[PDB]
């Protein structure tokens, strides 16, 4: 018997599944997925100081 214990809190996602990355596109309405964050929108550059 083996038991797994997953967890999803506010942390940089590390244990991701097997997937293939794609080339980045900008200034277009596209479906994006960044480390499990799924959504739709338009991606541009920014002046924010992270």
């Amino acid at each position: 018997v083996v038991v797994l214990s997953f967890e999803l809190l506010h942390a940089p996602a590390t244990v991701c599944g097997p997937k293939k990355s794609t080339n980045l596109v900008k200034n277009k309405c596209v479906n994006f997925n960044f480390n499990g964050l799924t959504g739709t929108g338009v991606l541009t550059k920014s002046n924010k100081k992270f």
Partner: protein
């Protein structure tokens, strides 16, 4: 060397840390967490 004199002093407004990894700007945020109380 091996003195460890103990005295009590005020703490004022010290001990504030970023509680998350979320960028915010020009926002007043209310947070509930473990903090060092003011003027202890």
């Amino acid at each position: 060397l091996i003195t460890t004199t103990q005295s009590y002093t005020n703490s004022f407004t010290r001990g504030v840390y970023y509680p998350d990894k979320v960028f915010r700007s020009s926002v007043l945020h209310l947070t509930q967490d473990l903090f060092l109380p003011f003027f202890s």
